[PDB]
Short mmCIF file of N, CA and C in Angstrom, two decimals:
data_model
loop_
_atom_site.label_atom_id
_atom_site.label_comp_id
_atom_site.label_asym_id
_atom_site.label_seq_id
_atom_site.Cartn_x
_atom_site.Cartn_y
_atom_site.Cartn_z
N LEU A 230 0.77 -1.10 -0.28
CA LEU A 230 -0.12 0.35 0.01
C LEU A 230 0.99 1.13 -0.16
N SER A 231 1.85 1.12 0.14
CA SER A 231 2.71 2.61 0.38
C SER A 231 3.19 2.17 -1.11
N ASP A 232 3.45 1.29 -1.62
CA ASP A 232 3.87 1.60 -2.73
C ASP A 232 3.03 1.91 -3.80
N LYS A 233 1.89 1.00 -3.51
CA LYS A 233 0.04 1.67 -4.45
C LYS A 233 0.12 2.94 -4.07
N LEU A 234 0.41 3.49 -2.98
CA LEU A 234 -0.17 4.45 -2.58
C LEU A 234 1.10 5.86 -2.87
N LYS A 235 2.40 5.22 -3.14
CA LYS A 235 3.47 6.57 -3.96
C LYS A 235 2.81 6.06 -5.32
N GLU A 236 2.38 5.08 -6.32
CA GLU A 236 2.19 4.29 -7.49
C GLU A 236 0.91 5.33 -7.28
N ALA A 237 -0.32 5.39 -6.59
CA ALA A 237 -1.05 6.06 -6.78
C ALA A 237 -1.13 7.35 -6.66
N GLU A 238 -0.05 7.93 -5.97
CA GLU A 238 0.17 9.08 -5.46
C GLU A 238 0.88 9.36 -6.96
N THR A 239 1.57 8.80 -7.60
CA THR A 239 2.43 8.75 -8.53
C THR A 239 1.53 9.27 -9.93
N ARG A 240 0.46 8.63 -9.83
CA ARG A 240 -0.97 8.48 -10.75
C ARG A 240 -1.69 10.06 -10.50
N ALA A 241 -2.31 10.25 -9.05
CA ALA A 241 -2.49 11.54 -8.42
C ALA A 241 -1.56 12.52 -8.77
N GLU A 242 -0.34 12.56 -8.74
CA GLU A 242 0.30 13.76 -8.90
C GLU A 242 0.69 13.60 -10.50
N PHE A 243 0.64 12.35 -11.05
CA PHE A 243 0.09 12.62 -12.84
C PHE A 243 -0.46 13.18 -13.14
N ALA A 244 -1.98 12.79 -12.68
CA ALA A 244 -3.15 13.01 -13.13
C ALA A 244 -3.05 14.70 -13.04
N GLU A 245 -2.65 15.36 -11.78
CA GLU A 245 -2.15 16.68 -11.17
C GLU A 245 -1.14 17.46 -12.35
N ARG A 246 -0.54 16.95 -12.76
CA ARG A 246 0.40 17.61 -13.55
C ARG A 246 0.05 17.36 -14.83
N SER A 247 -0.54 16.08 -15.29
CA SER A 247 -1.38 15.86 -16.47
C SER A 247 -2.34 16.79 -16.87
N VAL A 248 -2.87 17.30 -15.65
CA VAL A 248 -4.28 18.30 -15.31
C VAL A 248 -3.42 19.62 -15.63
N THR A 249 -2.86 19.61 -14.72
CA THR A 249 -2.22 21.15 -15.38
C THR A 249 -1.42 21.01 -16.61
N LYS A 250 -0.66 20.38 -17.06
CA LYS A 250 -0.97 20.28 -18.95
C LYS A 250 -1.52 20.59 -20.04
N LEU A 251 -2.68 20.20 -18.80
CA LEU A 251 -4.01 19.83 -19.86
C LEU A 251 -4.54 21.07 -19.24
N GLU A 252 -4.69 21.95 -18.20
CA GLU A 252 -4.79 23.01 -17.48
C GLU A 252 -4.29 23.85 -18.44
N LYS A 253 -2.86 24.02 -18.93
CA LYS A 253 -2.34 25.17 -19.63
C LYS A 253 -2.72 24.94 -21.21
N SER A 254 -3.13 23.05 -21.63
CA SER A 254 -3.56 22.84 -22.74
C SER A 254 -4.99 23.39 -23.27
N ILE A 255 -5.22 23.27 -21.95
CA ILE A 255 -6.66 23.73 -22.35
C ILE A 255 -6.72 25.61 -22.93
N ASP A 256 -6.17 26.11 -21.54
CA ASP A 256 -6.58 27.03 -21.57
C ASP A 256 -5.14 27.46 -22.69
N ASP A 257 -4.74 27.34 -23.81
CA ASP A 257 -3.84 27.59 -24.88
C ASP A 257 -4.70 27.09 -25.94
N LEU A 258 -5.93 25.95 -25.75
CA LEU A 258 -6.64 25.60 -27.07
C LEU A 258 -8.11 26.67 -26.32
N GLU A 259 -8.14 27.29 -25.21
CA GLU A 259 -9.29 28.03 -24.89
C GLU A 259 -8.74 29.35 -25.54
N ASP A 260 -7.22 30.04 -25.77
CA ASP A 260 -6.94 31.00 -26.04
C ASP A 260 -6.71 30.93 -27.65
N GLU A 261 -6.49 29.25 -27.94
CA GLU A 261 -6.22 29.54 -29.72
C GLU A 261 -7.17 29.68 -30.20
N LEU A 262 -8.45 28.90 -29.66
CA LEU A 262 -9.50 28.82 -30.27
C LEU A 262 -10.48 30.00 -30.40
N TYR A 263 -9.88 30.74 -29.27
CA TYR A 263 -10.52 32.09 -28.95
C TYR A 263 -9.78 33.01 -30.46
N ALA A 264 -8.63 33.15 -30.37
CA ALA A 264 -7.68 33.95 -31.04
C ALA A 264 -8.17 33.39 -32.35
N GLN A 265 -8.07 32.52 -32.94
CA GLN A 265 -8.12 32.12 -34.20
C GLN A 265 -9.87 32.18 -34.56
N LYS A 266 -11.01 32.76 -33.20
CA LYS A 266 -12.06 32.87 -34.01
C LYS A 266 -11.92 34.17 -34.21
N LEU A 267 -11.39 34.55 -33.20
CA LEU A 267 -11.62 36.28 -33.11
C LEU A 267 -10.60 36.97 -33.68
N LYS A 268 -9.61 36.47 -34.46
CA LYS A 268 -9.13 37.05 -36.04
C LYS A 268 -9.46 36.19 -36.66
N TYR A 269 -10.04 34.89 -36.84
CA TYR A 269 -10.82 34.44 -38.32
C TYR A 269 -11.91 34.73 -38.67
N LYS A 270 -12.94 34.97 -37.69
CA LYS A 270 -13.96 35.02 -38.45
C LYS A 270 -14.22 37.05 -38.00
N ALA A 271 -13.60 36.90 -37.36
CA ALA A 271 -13.52 38.84 -37.11
C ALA A 271 -12.53 39.39 -38.58
N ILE A 272 -11.96 38.41 -39.13
CA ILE A 272 -11.10 39.02 -40.17
C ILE A 272 -11.82 38.50 -41.32
N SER A 273 -12.26 37.61 -41.78
CA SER A 273 -12.67 36.97 -43.02
C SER A 273 -13.98 36.86 -42.76
N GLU A 274 -15.17 37.55 -41.85
CA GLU A 274 -16.14 38.07 -41.69
C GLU A 274 -16.01 39.25 -42.15
N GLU A 275 -15.29 39.51 -41.56
CA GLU A 275 -14.91 41.45 -42.07
C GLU A 275 -14.44 41.47 -43.62
N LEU A 276 -13.86 40.57 -44.17
CA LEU A 276 -13.32 40.56 -45.23
C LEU A 276 -14.76 40.16 -46.14
N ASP A 277 -15.56 39.83 -45.59
CA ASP A 277 -16.45 39.57 -46.34
C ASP A 277 -17.69 40.35 -45.96
N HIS A 278 -17.50 41.64 -45.43
CA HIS A 278 -17.69 42.63 -45.26
C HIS A 278 -17.55 43.29 -45.89
N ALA A 279 -16.52 43.31 -46.07
CA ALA A 279 -15.23 44.76 -46.84
C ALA A 279 -15.84 44.15 -48.26
N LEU A 280 -15.92 42.39 -48.66
CA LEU A 280 -17.14 42.23 -49.56
C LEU A 280 -18.14 42.72 -50.18
N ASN A 281 -19.41 43.27 -49.36
CA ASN A 281 -20.19 43.75 -49.61
C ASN A 281 -20.13 45.73 -50.07
N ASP A 282 -18.47 45.90 -50.13
CA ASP A 282 -18.28 47.00 -50.49
C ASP A 282 -17.31 46.98 -51.43
N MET A 283 -16.42 45.68 -51.54
CA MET A 283 -15.17 45.48 -51.98
C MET A 283 -15.89 44.98 -54.14
N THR A 284 -16.92 44.58 -53.90
CA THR A 284 -17.61 43.80 -54.90
C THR A 284 -19.13 45.09 -55.56
N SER A 285 -18.98 46.31 -54.52
CA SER A 285 -19.89 47.32 -55.16
C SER A 285 -19.24 47.96 -56.19
N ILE A 286 -19.67 48.54 -56.98
CA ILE A 286 -19.29 49.45 -58.25
C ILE A 286 -19.79 48.54 -59.48
N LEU B 13 -30.21 41.93 -63.85
CA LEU B 13 -29.54 40.91 -62.86
C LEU B 13 -29.91 41.18 -61.87
N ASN B 14 -31.11 41.05 -60.65
CA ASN B 14 -31.72 41.53 -59.47
C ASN B 14 -30.53 40.52 -58.61
N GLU B 15 -30.35 39.62 -59.52
CA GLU B 15 -29.32 38.05 -58.82
C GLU B 15 -28.12 38.22 -58.52
N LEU B 16 -27.48 39.55 -59.22
CA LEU B 16 -26.56 39.59 -58.88
C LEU B 16 -26.65 40.65 -57.94
N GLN B 17 -27.07 41.23 -57.73
CA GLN B 17 -27.28 42.12 -56.71
C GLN B 17 -27.90 41.40 -55.41
N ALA B 18 -28.28 40.41 -55.41
CA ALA B 18 -29.10 39.64 -54.36
C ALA B 18 -27.96 38.86 -53.82
N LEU B 19 -26.92 38.52 -54.76
CA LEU B 19 -26.05 37.54 -53.76
C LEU B 19 -24.72 38.33 -53.79
N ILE B 20 -24.48 39.60 -53.79
CA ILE B 20 -23.44 40.42 -53.64
C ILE B 20 -23.44 40.99 -52.27
N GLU B 21 -24.74 40.95 -52.28
CA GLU B 21 -25.47 41.78 -50.94
C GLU B 21 -25.79 40.60 -50.19
N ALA B 22 -26.53 39.22 -50.56
CA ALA B 22 -26.51 38.29 -49.72
C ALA B 22 -25.67 37.52 -48.93
N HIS B 23 -24.81 37.54 -50.12
CA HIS B 23 -23.06 37.08 -49.78
C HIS B 23 -22.37 37.86 -48.67
N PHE B 24 -22.24 38.95 -49.20
CA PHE B 24 -21.72 39.45 -48.02
C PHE B 24 -22.77 39.80 -46.35
N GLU B 25 -23.77 40.15 -46.53
CA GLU B 25 -24.30 40.72 -45.47
C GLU B 25 -24.89 39.43 -44.75
N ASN B 26 -25.66 38.20 -45.40
CA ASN B 26 -25.62 37.28 -44.29
C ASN B 26 -24.27 36.92 -43.93
N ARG B 27 -22.97 36.65 -44.53
CA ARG B 27 -21.93 35.93 -44.12
C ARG B 27 -21.50 37.18 -43.15
N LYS B 28 -21.07 38.23 -43.50
CA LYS B 28 -20.15 39.13 -42.68
C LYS B 28 -20.94 39.27 -41.11
N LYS B 29 -22.47 39.56 -40.89
CA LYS B 29 -23.05 39.19 -39.89
C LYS B 29 -23.21 38.04 -39.27
N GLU B 30 -23.55 37.00 -39.30
CA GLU B 30 -23.84 35.67 -38.72
C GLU B 30 -21.61 35.27 -38.14
N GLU B 31 -21.41 35.37 -39.41
CA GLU B 31 -19.73 35.40 -39.38
C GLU B 31 -19.26 35.29 -37.91
N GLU B 32 -19.37 36.54 -38.06
CA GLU B 32 -18.08 37.67 -37.26
C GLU B 32 -18.74 37.80 -35.93
N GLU B 33 -20.29 37.40 -35.72
CA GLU B 33 -21.11 36.99 -34.40
C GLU B 33 -20.01 35.51 -34.23
N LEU B 34 -20.16 34.51 -34.69
CA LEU B 34 -19.67 33.31 -34.04
C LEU B 34 -18.50 34.23 -34.03
N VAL B 35 -17.76 34.60 -34.50
CA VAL B 35 -16.82 34.13 -34.25
C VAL B 35 -16.45 35.27 -32.81
N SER B 36 -17.16 36.76 -32.15
CA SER B 36 -16.97 36.59 -31.20
C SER B 36 -17.82 35.91 -30.09
N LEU B 37 -19.20 35.39 -30.59
CA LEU B 37 -19.49 34.60 -29.32
C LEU B 37 -18.66 33.42 -28.92
N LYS B 38 -17.98 32.52 -30.16
CA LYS B 38 -17.29 31.42 -29.89
C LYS B 38 -15.79 32.06 -28.93
N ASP B 39 -15.78 33.72 -28.64
CA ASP B 39 -14.31 33.85 -28.77
C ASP B 39 -14.94 33.99 -26.82
N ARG B 40 -15.49 33.97 -26.72
CA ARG B 40 -16.38 34.48 -24.72
C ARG B 40 -16.35 33.12 -24.41
N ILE B 41 -16.90 31.86 -25.33
CA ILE B 41 -16.93 30.19 -24.94
C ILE B 41 -15.37 30.46 -24.81
N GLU B 42 -14.63 30.40 -25.32
CA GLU B 42 -13.26 29.87 -25.35
C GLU B 42 -12.62 30.68 -24.35
N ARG B 43 -13.30 31.35 -24.20
CA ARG B 43 -12.60 32.46 -22.80
C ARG B 43 -12.54 31.77 -21.96
N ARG B 44 -14.07 31.46 -21.82
CA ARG B 44 -14.90 30.49 -20.63
C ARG B 44 -13.93 29.31 -20.35
N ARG B 45 -13.83 28.73 -21.23
CA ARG B 45 -13.43 27.28 -20.97
C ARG B 45 -12.09 27.63 -20.71
N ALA B 46 -11.12 28.80 -21.24
CA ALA B 46 -10.04 28.87 -20.91
C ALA B 46 -10.00 28.98 -19.36
N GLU B 47 -11.20 29.76 -18.59
CA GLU B 47 -11.08 30.06 -17.23
C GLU B 47 -11.14 28.28 -16.63
N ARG B 48 -11.51 27.62 -17.27
CA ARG B 48 -11.78 26.81 -16.28
C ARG B 48 -10.43 26.15 -16.88
N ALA B 49 -10.04 26.31 -17.37
CA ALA B 49 -7.99 25.45 -17.63
C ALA B 49 -7.59 26.30 -16.08
N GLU B 50 -7.95 27.23 -15.86
CA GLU B 50 -7.62 28.36 -15.31
C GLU B 50 -7.56 27.90 -13.97
N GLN B 51 -8.68 27.38 -14.04
CA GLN B 51 -9.43 27.00 -12.64
C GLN B 51 -9.10 25.62 -12.14
N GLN B 52 -8.47 24.55 -13.22
CA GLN B 52 -8.30 23.46 -12.75
C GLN B 52 -7.06 23.68 -12.25
N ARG B 53 -6.15 24.88 -12.58
CA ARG B 53 -4.45 25.07 -12.26
C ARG B 53 -5.11 25.18 -10.66
N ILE B 54 -5.89 26.25 -10.93
CA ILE B 54 -6.19 26.64 -9.68
C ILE B 54 -6.56 25.53 -8.33
N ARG B 55 -7.40 24.69 -8.97
CA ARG B 55 -7.94 23.18 -8.46
C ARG B 55 -6.87 22.51 -8.00
N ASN B 56 -5.51 22.12 -8.65
CA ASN B 56 -4.73 21.49 -8.35
C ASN B 56 -3.58 21.65 -7.79
N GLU B 57 -3.47 23.05 -7.72
CA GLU B 57 -2.89 23.72 -6.46
C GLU B 57 -3.84 24.03 -5.58
N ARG B 58 -4.45 23.84 -5.19
CA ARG B 58 -5.15 24.43 -4.02
C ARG B 58 -5.36 22.65 -2.93
N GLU B 59 -5.35 21.14 -4.07
CA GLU B 59 -5.35 20.26 -3.51
C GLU B 59 -3.94 19.75 -2.72
N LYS B 60 -2.73 20.70 -3.42
CA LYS B 60 -1.55 19.97 -3.24
C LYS B 60 -1.50 21.00 -2.13
N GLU B 61 -2.08 22.21 -2.21
CA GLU B 61 -1.50 22.90 -0.49
C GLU B 61 -2.29 22.47 0.78
N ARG B 62 -3.40 21.82 0.32
CA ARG B 62 -3.86 21.75 1.19
C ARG B 62 -3.24 20.07 2.04
N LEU C 230 -3.07 3.43 5.38
CA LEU C 230 -2.57 3.52 3.53
C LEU C 230 -3.65 3.47 3.22
N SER C 231 -4.30 2.82 3.65
CA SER C 231 -5.74 2.26 2.20
C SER C 231 -6.36 3.40 2.65
N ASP C 232 -6.58 4.16 3.27
CA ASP C 232 -7.31 5.01 3.33
C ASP C 232 -6.63 6.69 2.51
N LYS C 233 -4.88 6.82 2.61
CA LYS C 233 -4.56 7.78 2.01
C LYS C 233 -4.16 6.72 0.45
N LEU C 234 -4.75 5.82 -0.15
CA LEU C 234 -4.54 5.30 -1.32
C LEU C 234 -5.95 5.47 -1.66
N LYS C 235 -6.74 5.03 -0.47
CA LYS C 235 -7.82 5.70 -1.56
C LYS C 235 -8.15 6.63 -2.28
N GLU C 236 -7.75 7.98 -1.25
CA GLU C 236 -7.62 8.84 -1.46
C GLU C 236 -6.61 9.70 -3.11
N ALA C 237 -5.52 8.56 -2.91
CA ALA C 237 -4.55 9.45 -4.04
C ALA C 237 -4.68 8.67 -5.41
N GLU C 238 -5.85 7.18 -4.75
CA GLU C 238 -6.57 6.32 -6.37
C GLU C 238 -7.57 7.29 -6.75
N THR C 239 -8.49 7.97 -5.76
CA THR C 239 -9.68 8.41 -6.22
C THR C 239 -9.41 9.46 -6.67
N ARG C 240 -8.46 10.34 -6.27
CA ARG C 240 -7.82 12.05 -6.60
C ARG C 240 -7.96 11.00 -8.17
N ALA C 241 -6.46 10.73 -8.10
CA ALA C 241 -5.77 10.04 -9.72
C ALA C 241 -7.01 9.96 -10.33
N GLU C 242 -8.18 8.52 -9.99
CA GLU C 242 -9.08 8.48 -11.02
C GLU C 242 -9.59 9.55 -11.57
N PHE C 243 -10.20 10.07 -10.62
CA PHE C 243 -11.03 12.16 -10.99
C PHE C 243 -10.06 12.56 -11.31
N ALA C 244 -8.85 12.76 -11.16
CA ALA C 244 -7.58 14.00 -11.62
C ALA C 244 -8.02 12.97 -12.92
N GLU C 245 -7.53 11.72 -12.87
CA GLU C 245 -7.51 11.25 -14.70
C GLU C 245 -9.01 11.98 -16.05
N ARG C 246 -10.19 12.25 -14.74
CA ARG C 246 -11.45 12.28 -15.98
C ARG C 246 -10.62 13.62 -16.23
N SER C 247 -10.08 14.37 -14.67
CA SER C 247 -10.00 16.05 -15.71
C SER C 247 -8.72 15.50 -16.21
N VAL C 248 -8.38 14.73 -16.71
CA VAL C 248 -6.89 14.84 -18.05
C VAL C 248 -8.19 14.16 -18.96
N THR C 249 -8.65 13.49 -19.21
CA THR C 249 -9.72 13.02 -19.87
C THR C 249 -10.39 13.96 -20.74
N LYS C 250 -11.40 15.17 -19.46
CA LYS C 250 -12.03 15.96 -19.88
C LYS C 250 -11.27 17.13 -20.44
N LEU C 251 -10.13 17.94 -20.08
CA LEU C 251 -9.59 18.48 -20.38
C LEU C 251 -8.72 18.48 -21.69
N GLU C 252 -8.80 16.96 -22.05
CA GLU C 252 -8.04 16.29 -22.87
C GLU C 252 -8.82 16.60 -24.01
N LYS C 253 -10.35 15.99 -24.09
CA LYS C 253 -11.76 16.17 -24.93
C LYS C 253 -11.48 16.90 -25.18
N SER C 254 -11.61 18.14 -23.90
CA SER C 254 -12.31 19.86 -24.46
C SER C 254 -10.75 20.13 -25.50
N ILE C 255 -10.00 19.57 -25.51
CA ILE C 255 -9.01 20.07 -26.25
C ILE C 255 -8.48 19.80 -27.55
N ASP C 256 -9.48 18.44 -27.40
CA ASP C 256 -9.39 17.95 -28.70
C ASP C 256 -10.63 18.16 -29.23
N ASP C 257 -11.81 19.03 -28.95
CA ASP C 257 -13.20 19.13 -29.65
C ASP C 257 -12.94 20.94 -30.02
N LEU C 258 -11.71 21.72 -28.76
CA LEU C 258 -11.57 22.94 -29.20
C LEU C 258 -10.84 22.75 -30.30
N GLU C 259 -10.14 21.71 -30.43
CA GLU C 259 -8.64 21.48 -31.58
C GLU C 259 -9.64 21.29 -32.78
N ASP C 260 -11.29 20.56 -32.84
CA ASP C 260 -11.78 19.98 -34.02
C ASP C 260 -12.30 21.35 -34.18
N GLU C 261 -12.79 22.34 -33.05
CA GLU C 261 -13.51 23.53 -33.46
C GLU C 261 -12.57 24.76 -34.39
N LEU C 262 -11.22 24.65 -33.93
CA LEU C 262 -10.20 25.65 -33.79
C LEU C 262 -10.21 25.50 -35.34
N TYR C 263 -9.69 23.76 -35.78
CA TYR C 263 -9.62 23.38 -36.67
C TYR C 263 -10.80 23.71 -38.01
N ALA C 264 -12.11 23.68 -37.49
CA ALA C 264 -13.34 24.13 -38.66
C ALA C 264 -13.00 25.37 -38.29
N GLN C 265 -12.53 26.35 -37.54
CA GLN C 265 -12.61 27.43 -37.88
C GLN C 265 -11.53 28.43 -38.64
N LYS C 266 -10.06 27.56 -38.60
CA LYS C 266 -9.13 27.90 -39.60
C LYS C 266 -9.49 27.40 -40.89
N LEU C 267 -10.87 26.53 -41.06
CA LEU C 267 -11.47 26.14 -42.44
C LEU C 267 -11.64 26.60 -42.99
N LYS C 268 -12.69 27.63 -42.03
CA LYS C 268 -13.70 28.63 -42.34
C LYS C 268 -12.66 29.89 -42.67
N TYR C 269 -11.48 29.76 -41.76
CA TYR C 269 -11.05 31.21 -42.53
C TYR C 269 -10.37 31.39 -43.27
N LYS C 270 -9.77 29.98 -43.74
CA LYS C 270 -9.46 29.75 -44.91
C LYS C 270 -10.09 29.78 -46.13
N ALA C 271 -11.17 28.72 -46.00
CA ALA C 271 -11.89 29.23 -46.89
C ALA C 271 -12.72 30.39 -47.30
N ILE C 272 -12.96 31.19 -46.42
CA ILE C 272 -13.05 32.39 -46.40
C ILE C 272 -12.46 33.49 -47.32
N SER C 273 -11.19 32.95 -46.79
CA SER C 273 -9.63 34.46 -47.40
C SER C 273 -9.69 33.44 -48.78
N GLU C 274 -9.70 32.59 -48.83
CA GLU C 274 -9.19 31.86 -50.37
C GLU C 274 -10.65 32.58 -50.55
N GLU C 275 -11.36 32.10 -50.46
CA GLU C 275 -12.97 32.22 -50.94
C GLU C 275 -12.64 34.06 -52.13
N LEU C 276 -12.06 34.32 -50.94
CA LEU C 276 -12.36 35.94 -51.32
C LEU C 276 -11.06 36.31 -52.36
N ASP C 277 -9.64 35.91 -51.94
CA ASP C 277 -8.74 35.52 -52.55
C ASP C 277 -8.95 35.90 -53.96
N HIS C 278 -9.77 34.23 -54.25
CA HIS C 278 -9.73 33.52 -55.29
C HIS C 278 -10.63 34.28 -55.90
N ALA C 279 -11.53 34.81 -55.61
CA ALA C 279 -12.81 35.29 -56.35
C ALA C 279 -12.68 36.80 -56.93
N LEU C 280 -11.69 37.54 -55.48
CA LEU C 280 -10.54 38.28 -55.86
C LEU C 280 -9.83 38.66 -57.29
N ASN C 281 -9.06 37.09 -57.39
CA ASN C 281 -7.81 37.37 -58.48
C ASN C 281 -9.10 36.97 -59.50
N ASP C 282 -9.68 36.41 -59.71
CA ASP C 282 -10.38 35.72 -60.92
C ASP C 282 -11.45 37.75 -61.10
N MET C 283 -11.41 38.63 -60.12
CA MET C 283 -12.32 39.72 -59.93
C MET C 283 -11.41 40.83 -59.75
N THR C 284 -10.19 40.70 -59.94
CA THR C 284 -9.18 42.24 -59.60
C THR C 284 -9.87 42.73 -60.82
N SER C 285 -9.29 42.22 -61.72
CA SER C 285 -9.84 42.77 -62.72
C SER C 285 -11.26 42.63 -63.31
N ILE C 286 -12.08 43.76 -62.87
CA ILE C 286 -13.33 43.80 -62.65
C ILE C 286 -13.97 43.80 -61.69
#
């Protein structure tokens, strides 16, 4: 049990670290998805707004 | 060609409005999910501190 | 140790669910990012394409 605990603790710590890595990667995806939307729909939608004007004339 | 006019505007107006809104609507969802990531970081720190 | 193990194992398995939840969310955010990237790409390219075709006039 001491080893099962160290192993479970390694797993708990692993999971805390894995969760930490994923806390970081979820935030990176939360920020990257955010940034990509924020810049991608905002720019390309904007480019379609610009289409409204670009294709006028 | 009323259709070219309908399309030149429908393409632009329907998409810029719907699409740019999805960009910012989801940007907020994403930011909240990123906050969840921060809250998990906080949760991990708190469990270790306890 | 049995209690500490139950907590380390419970915390590990739970945290492992946080690992799979963050991981899953990361994959879903990446599928969304991809879809966003794809739409961005498709829009910028559709416009750039159409613009190249329609630079002239």
